[PDB]
Amino acid sequence: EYLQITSTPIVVDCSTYVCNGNVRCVELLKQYTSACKTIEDALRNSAMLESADVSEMLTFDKKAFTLANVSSFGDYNLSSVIPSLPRSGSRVAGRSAIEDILFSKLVTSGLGTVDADYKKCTKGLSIADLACAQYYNGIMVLPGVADAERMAMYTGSLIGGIALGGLTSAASIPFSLAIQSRLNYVALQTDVLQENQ
Amino acid sequence: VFVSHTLTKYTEVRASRQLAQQKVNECVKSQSKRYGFCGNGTHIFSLVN
Amino acid sequence: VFVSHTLTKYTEVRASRQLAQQKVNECVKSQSKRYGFCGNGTHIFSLVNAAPEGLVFLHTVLLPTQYKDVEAWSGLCVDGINGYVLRQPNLALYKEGNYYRITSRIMFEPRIPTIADFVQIENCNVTFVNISRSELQTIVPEYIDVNK
Amino acid sequence: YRITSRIMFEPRIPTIADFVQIENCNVTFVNISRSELQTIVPEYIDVNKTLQELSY
Amino acid sequence: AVLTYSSFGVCADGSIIAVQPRNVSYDSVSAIVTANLSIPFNWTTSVQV
Amino acid sequence: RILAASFNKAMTNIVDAFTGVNDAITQTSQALQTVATALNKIQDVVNQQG
Numbered sequence: 001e002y003l004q005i006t007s008t009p010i011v012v013d014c015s016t017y018v019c020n021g022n023v024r025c026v027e028l029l030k031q032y033t034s035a036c037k038t039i040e041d042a043l044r045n046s047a048m049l050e051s052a053d054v055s056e057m058l059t060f061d062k063k064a065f066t067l068a069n070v071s072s073f074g075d076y077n078l079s080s081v082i083p084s085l086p087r088s089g090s091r092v093a094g095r096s097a098i099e100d101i102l103f104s105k106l107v108t109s110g111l112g113t114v115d116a117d118y119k120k121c122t123k124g125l126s127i128a129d130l131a132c133a134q135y136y137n138g139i140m141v142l143p144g145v146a147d148a149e150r151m152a153m154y155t156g157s158l159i160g161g162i163a164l165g166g167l168t169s170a171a172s173i174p175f176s177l178a179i180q181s182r183l184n185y186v187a188l189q190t191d192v193l194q195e196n197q
Numbered sequence: 198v199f200v201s202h203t204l205t206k207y208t209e210v211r212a213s214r215q216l217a218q219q220k221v222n223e224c225v226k227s228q229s230k231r232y233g234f235c236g237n238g239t240h241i242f243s244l245v246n
Numbered sequence: 247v248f249v250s251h252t253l254t255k256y257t258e259v260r261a262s263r264q265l266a267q268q269k270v271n272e273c274v275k276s277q278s279k280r281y282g283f284c285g286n287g288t289h290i291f292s293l294v295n296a297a298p299e300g301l302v303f304l305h306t307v308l309l310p311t312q313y314k315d316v317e318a319w320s321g322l323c324v325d326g327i328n329g330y331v332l333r334q335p336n337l338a339l340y341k342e343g344n345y346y347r348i349t350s351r352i353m354f355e356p357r358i359p360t361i362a363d364f365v366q367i368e369n370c371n372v373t374f375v376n377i378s379r380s381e382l383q384t385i386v387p388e389y390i391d392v393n394k
Numbered sequence: 395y396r397i398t399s400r401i402m403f404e405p406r407i408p409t410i411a412d413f414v415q416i417e418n419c420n421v422t423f424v425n426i427s428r429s430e431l432q433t434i435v436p437e438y439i440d441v442n443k444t445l446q447e448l449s450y
Numbered sequence: 451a452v453l454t455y456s457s458f459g460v461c462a463d464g465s466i467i468a469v470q471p472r473n474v475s476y477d478s479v480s481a482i483v484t485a486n487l488s489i490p491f492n493w494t495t496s497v498q499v
Numbered sequence: 500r501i502l503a504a505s506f507n508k509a510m511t512n513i514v515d516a517f518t519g520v521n522d523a524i525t526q527t528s529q530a531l532q533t534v535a536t537a538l539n540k541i542q543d544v545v546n547q548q549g
């Protein structure tokens with residue numbers, strides 16, 4: 001099942017988009033007192049609320065993140081969902097073997113909704129990029145809320161939570177006993193050999 | 198016209214985000230008995246990526 | 247343009263209004279076990295007050311502060327042929343000092359083992375407690391062997 | 395006789411604690427006398443009648 | 451971070467920093483094992499809005 | 500006894516956080532961070548009406 005949790009936020013400067021920076025036009029725009037106020041407030045406030053409640057959902061647990069490993073699941077091969085090692089250091093996580101597929105096998109449709117680089121627009125040597133041209137019109141795309149690093153920390157912690165069993169000193173249980181515990185929640189298990197595992 | 202399209206998208210994404218939060222708390226962190234909420238059949242555990 | 251703004255806001259408020267009714271029915275009137283719906287942790291009760299254009303909720307929840315270690319056992323095996331497990335999966339049998347006690351796994355609520363706390367099963371696991379019917383009274387203080 | 399869960403087949407030896415006493419019977423219940431109740435519940439012992447005989 | 455957007459937030463003095471995820475301790479499903487178990491023992495009351 | 504003493508302490512901090520006499524310290528507890536989040540959401544609703 002797939003559920004969307006965020007949308008790339010876009011903010012627009014009302015004065016630059018309508019007047020192109022012409023000084024005379026800016027004075028005429030003041031007659032439309034509530035026109036720009038409504039447009040800027042709606043885009044700015046919606047983006048801040050979106051980033052506020054997304055950051056509330058992203059919890060982390062260092063204890064559970066350590067258990068996101070193939071050695072913690074036994075016969076259940078979770079290698080396709082655990083995070084990848086930090087290939088270049090300076091970080092604690094990375095994309096799983098399924099996240100990079102969904103993020104790359106899907107079309108690289110960078111036709112405008114790119115949080116492109118702003119520091120090269122005003123001092124660059126080459127003619128302006130398609131993204132810089134939008135920035136000159138006051139349309140600027142903010143960086144995505146769901147950061148790539150926070151995602152791997154968040155998902156890695158949740159996957160590792162399934163290996164926790166409430167043991168003293170945080171010892172990890174065999175994963176065959178985690179499934180048995182969740183089966184007992186359905187109906188009290190009377191089988192002793194546990195061959196059904 | 199642009200603001201109308203964006204605000205409608207934020208309304209749709211907010212509803213889907215709140216459903217995702219419920220599935221993280223009830224299907225991933227916990228085990229659910231609400232039929233059909235975490236797939237059909239008897240739920241055991243869920244994974245998220 | 248004004249109609250578009252009002253219809254967009256009505257759709258947003260209607261979605262939030264439906265969630266408020268669910269929380270009033272499941273968190274304020276009743277007590278919920280749906281994790282995270284009435285705040286994180288274990289829900290006890292909720293309060294509600296008026297607010298500008300809406301409601302404000304005050305979820306009262308319990309958070310743990312200390313934990314107790316217990317030497318828990320999976321079950322019992324009497325004479326090597328009669329196996330027993332706890333009647334409720336949320337209970338745990340543990341050893342304290344020389345005797346035994348049963349406690350819930352959610353809250354530490356000690357309980358004296360009664361024969362009704364167990365369920366008889368066909369086989370015995372190797373991790374079960376070995377004991378005979380002669381000494382079963384050390385685990386269940388009310389057990390009396392009426393045969394012997 | 396055995397007891398099982400209705401969701402998963404989990405065979406269980408019937409214990410006296412698995413039953414709840416009610417005021418009246420039904421024509422569809424297992425029709426049995428107390429001396430034979432041990433055939434349904436292996437751990438059951440009629441300590442009432444057994445002590446009467448052992449008083450001699 | 452007094453104000454936040456995406457991965458970065460700002461302080462009361464205007465310093466820009468990255469927003470780290472909120473640290474919490476996840477719950478767990480107590481296992482039916484012959485092992486050494488930790489059970490919650492003392493409790494506190496918290497109010498959330 | 501402890502549950503009642505803890506509840507009264509939380510309610511007092513909730514009322515003080517709503518009044519906003521110590522706004523710059525309420526972030527010290529994520530329980531009080533819910534109050535800050537609630538206040539921000541109420542302000543947006545009030546300002547955007549007109």
Ligand SMILES: *[C@@H]1O[C@H](CO)[C@@H](O[C@@H]2O[C@H](CO)[C@@H](O[C@@H]3O[C@H](CO[C@H]4O[C@H](CO)[C@@H](O)[C@H](O)[C@@H]4O)[C@@H](O)[C@H](O[C@H]4O[C@H](CO)[C@@H](O)[C@H](O)[C@@H]4O)[C@@H]3O)[C@H](O)[C@H]2NC(C)=O)[C@H](O)[C@H]1NC(C)=O
Pocket residue numbers: 326372373374375376
């Ligand atoms: C509760 O009580 C029960 C019943 O008493 C205990 O269960 C038995 O526990 C014993 C050990 O305490 C187990 O015996 C060990 O089994 C091993 C395999 O035996 C199988 O295979 C051989 C093949 O030759 C067969 O002969 C045999 O019938 C079995 O099929 C052996 O490896 C062990 O040998 C011991 O001695 C040698 C030499 O000294 C050592 O190298 C070994 O390490 C070992 O010590 C031994 O015989 C037995 O299998 C358990 N089950 C049964 C059904 O008998 C529980 O352990 C006890 N639990 C608690 C918590 O108290």
Ligand SMILES: *[C@@H]1O[C@H](CO)[C@@H](O[C@@H]2O[C@H](CO)[C@@H](O[C@@H]3O[C@H](CO[C@H]4O[C@H](CO)[C@@H](O)[C@H](O)[C@@H]4O)[C@@H](O)[C@H](O[C@H]4O[C@H](CO)[C@@H](O)[C@H](O)[C@@H]4O)[C@@H]3O)[C@H](O)[C@H]2NC(C)=O)[C@H](O)[C@H]1NC(C)=O
Pocket residue numbers: 421422423424425
């Ligand atoms: C466990 O043990 C009990 C007690 O013996 C059994 O319960 C009785 O079962 C018998 C049949 O085996 C039933 O008797 C039948 O009742 C009819 C009369 O009406 C009944 O109902 C009214 C109230 O509505 C009462 O006032 C009245 O007294 C009766 O009880 C008749 O239609 C039947 O006649 C049939 O059998 C006779 C032999 O008796 C034949 O000659 C006839 O041709 C005809 O076939 C019959 O007598 C009785 O009603 C049951 N009692 C109760 C209290 O329900 C259980 O059946 C038994 N269970 C098992 C599983 O073995």
Ligand SMILES: *[C@@H]1O[C@H](CO)[C@@H](O[C@@H]2O[C@H](CO)[C@@H](O[C@@H]3O[C@H](CO[C@H]4O[C@H](CO)[C@@H](O)[C@H](O)[C@@H]4O)[C@@H](O)[C@H](O[C@H]4O[C@H](CO)[C@@H](O)[C@H](O)[C@@H]4O)[C@@H]3O)[C@H](O)[C@H]2NC(C)=O)[C@H](O)[C@H]1NC(C)=O
Pocket residue numbers: 286287309473474475476477496528529530
């Ligand atoms: C539901 O939401 C509640 C809160 O509403 C969450 O509960 C909090 O969880 C966190 C994370 O575990 C707890 O924080 C821990 O507290 C301990 C005590 O704090 C000491 O240190 C702080 C800061 O220095 C002082 O203010 C305080 O006086 C204490 O001296 C620490 O032991 C924990 O670890 C810290 O220290 C070690 C050692 O340096 C470091 O390795 C750690 O990284 C960390 O810094 C940690 O800080 C907090 O106490 C919980 N309660 C409350 C009321 O906030 C639940 O987690 C959440 N539950 C669920 C199931 O979702």
Ligand SMILES: *[C@@H]1O[C@H](CO)[C@@H](O[C@@H]2O[C@H](CO)[C@@H](O[C@@H]3O[C@H](CO[C@H]4O[C@H](CO)[C@@H](O)[C@H](O)[C@@H]4O)[C@@H](O)[C@H](O)[C@@H]3O)[C@H](O)[C@H]2NC(C)=O)[C@H](O)[C@H]1NC(C)=O
Pocket residue numbers: 077079080
């Ligand atoms: C759990 O699932 C994992 C993912 O499916 C399993 O990993 C796979 O295991 C198989 C069998 O060992 C590997 O297939 C062999 O691979 C080698 C070549 O491997 C190298 O090249 C491939 C190029 O495709 C590259 O993907 C690998 O990473 C290696 O660099 C060949 O000699 C064989 O023909 C054969 O195809 C898979 O490649 C491997 N996949 C991954 C992503 O590692 C894993 O084995 C399962 N775990 C358990 C315990 O069963």
Ligand SMILES: *[C@@H]1O[C@H](CO)[C@@H](O[C@@H]2O[C@H](CO)[C@@H](O[C@@H]3O[C@H](CO[C@H]4O[C@H](CO)[C@@H](O)[C@H](O)[C@@H]4O)[C@@H](O)[C@H](O)[C@@H]3O)[C@H](O)[C@H]2NC(C)=O)[C@H](O)[C@H]1NC(C)=O
Pocket residue numbers: 174192193320371372373482483484
């Ligand atoms: C019912 O009895 C079962 C045995 O018939 C119990 O299963 C045993 O549970 C213990 C305690 O959790 C496990 O011991 C741990 O095992 C690992 C090594 O496990 C791996 O290797 C063994 C063979 O050496 C293999 O059988 C396992 O599947 C794993 O591949 C160590 O890290 C620990 O030190 C510790 O000894 C036993 O491994 C496990 N036995 C088996 C055959 O799986 C079971 O717990 C009982 N059930 C209940 C509900 O009490």
Ligand SMILES: *[C@@H]1O[C@H](CO)[C@@H](O[C@@H]2O[C@H](CO)[C@@H](O)[C@H](O)[C@H]2NC(C)=O)[C@H](O)[C@H]1NC(C)=O
Pocket residue numbers: 062092470471472473
């Ligand atoms: C959440 O806890 C983890 C540790 O479990 C923190 O991660 C590191 O912790 C040390 C010790 O405090 C810090 O000095 C490091 O800078 C942290 N590194 C990283 C990459 O975060 C984590 O920062 C904690 N976060 C909060 C908000 O408490």
Ligand SMILES: *[C@@H]1O[C@H](CO)[C@@H](O[C@@H]2O[C@H](CO)[C@@H](O)[C@H](O)[C@H]2NC(C)=O)[C@H](O)[C@H]1NC(C)=O
Pocket residue numbers: 068069070071082083084085
């Ligand atoms: C799963 O756990 C193993 C064991 O800790 C990790 O393997 C170690 O990885 C580090 C680098 O991160 C190496 O320096 C160690 O030598 C490795 N251990 C062994 C025994 O060789 C493994 O990296 C963990 N998996 C992930 C995805 O982090």
Ligand SMILES: *[C@@H]1O[C@H](CO)[C@@H](O[C@@H]2O[C@H](CO)[C@@H](O)[C@H](O)[C@H]2NC(C)=O)[C@H](O)[C@H]1NC(C)=O
Pocket residue numbers: 393439440
């Ligand atoms: C008490 O004692 C005996 C063993 O001492 C148990 O075994 C036999 O059980 C059958 C019933 O299936 C009785 O008919 C036999 O008479 C019993 N043998 C003896 C020597 O008594 C018996 O199950 C136990 N319970 C009772 C009620 O006797």
Ligand SMILES: *[C@@H]1O[C@H](CO)[C@@H](O[C@@H]2O[C@H](CO)[C@@H](O)[C@H](O)[C@H]2NC(C)=O)[C@H](O)[C@H]1NC(C)=O
Pocket residue numbers: 492493501504
């Ligand atoms: C549970 O925790 C409470 C809260 O700390 C404990 O009550 C405190 O106990 C200490 C030590 O006896 C006293 O100095 C404090 O005055 C008590 N009150 C508070 C509000 O901290 C209580 O003792 C603990 N209970 C158990 C069974 O460990």
